[model samples]
Target: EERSAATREALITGARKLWGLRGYAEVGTPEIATEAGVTRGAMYHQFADKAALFRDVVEVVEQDVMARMATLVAASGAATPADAIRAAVDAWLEVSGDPEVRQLILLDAPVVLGWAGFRDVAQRYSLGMTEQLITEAIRAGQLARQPVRPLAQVLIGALDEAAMFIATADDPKRARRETRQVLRRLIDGMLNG
Candidate 1:
């Protein structure tokens, strides 16, 4: 079990680094094994295939992103539930700009994991946080009382699409600025409407 755990860690670490720098399709399994200093057999034993290893890598990165966002949102000390939601939106955009997040989580993950798998995992992390935030806003009377889950889901969809839009733009810096502005407007409207 110890050896198995070590192999799993090494593969995930190596895959994370490589996938962060390169696209998923560009990376091969043997190179991941070589980078991890594990035999190809060991890599295979640890994971069913490269896609399986990529799933683990994506989970690790997404979890870290969620943690970072949590810290930023808490430190923001936002004045209201609506303000907290805005702070979280900003934190998400900031995190999305990171190279690993751009390459691995946003760009590659959905394609590799498929929409269903990607969304399911996201529901466990960011989506869950989003729901809580929305619930708080509703309870605080900042947002209209309605179905929280659907609203959260739509907001998350917008955020994810906005991140991808920023990532793939020829001018990502400009895109980020534009997206942040638009998101703020959307949030304000949602809160006030």
Candidate 2:
């Protein structure tokens, strides 16, 4: 049991390091094993394959993103729907600019996991959570009466694209600011206009 626990921890640590530095496809199982100071067989014993490890990493990153957004919304003290929307957008941009997050999840996920695989996981985990949040906002009368699911899709898709651009930019801060502006515009149109 202790050995298994140690192996699991080693796997996660290695994955986190490689995902941050080299991204998904660029980092191999052998390399991960070496970095984690474990044998390839031991690493494989802990995880089914590189894809499984990537999936776990993506899941953790996605959860962290969502949790940050939730915390921001809850702490905003925004009295109006518009204020809440702005707060949410700002918080999302802030979180998206996280360096390790940008490197590990956004920049590397698609390259390592492929589009279809990434999309499947993204829809099941990230999109569903965002959609649920939108549904809650609508129920609270914090958003206009509209199709919550589609709006959530649009919101998340836009943010994903924007985050990708920012993550790959020469001047990430400028990219993030521009993205934040676009997001603000989107929220304004959706809620007020």
Candidate 3:
């Protein structure tokens, strides 16, 4: 039982690195089992299929990203709650810029899992912080008082797109430059427009 558990951990970690670094379709179960130090048959017994493995990989990365974001917010010690929100956006951009993160969570998960499934899992890690910040901003009169959930969704949608644009840029510096420049202008509108 202990040995099987270790194999499961290895499978989860291996899948997270490979799928995150490369993506889903190209990788096969044999390669994954090799990485996990287990037989393909064991993998089948361990997980029903590749999709299940990939889903577990997503969960690992999501928790990691959430921890990083939470730490950034706590460390920033920004003056206002709004500034904490802004800090989180910046931190998310940095975290999302990682090739593994960009390839797996930001770019491929939605495509692989389908939009609704991806969104549902994503909300597990991100939606709470986003909703809280937007609610604070609304209460502070920085944003329009409307449906909080819809507003949080819109904010995250834009931020995620911008993060993807940065992740895929050829000249990443220029891309980061332009994205940050335009992002501030664009997001500032949400602050007061």
Sort every candidate by TM-score, greatest first. Answer: 1, 3, 2
Residue 76 CA displacement from its true place in model 3, Å: 1.8
- TM-score on alpha carbons, each prediction: 0.94, 0.83, 0.89
In model 2, what is the error at residue 14, expressed in angstroms?
Answer: 2.0
**What lDDT would each prediction earn against the true structure?**
0.91, 0.78, 0.83
Best by TM-score: 1
Model 3 clashing residue pairs (backbone)? none
lDDT of 3 by residue, 142-188 (tens): 77788989887887888888887888788877887787777677667
Model with the higher TM-score, candidate 1 or 2: 1
lDDT score, candidate 2: 0.78
Those runs of model 3 whose alpha carbons end farther than 4 Å from true positions after fitting are: 139-144, 190-193
* Model 1: worst 10 consecutive residues (lDDT sum): 184-193
- lDDT tens per residue, model 2, 46-118: 7988878887878777788788887887799977656766787788777878887888767777777789987
How many steric overlaps are in each model, in order?
0, 0, 0
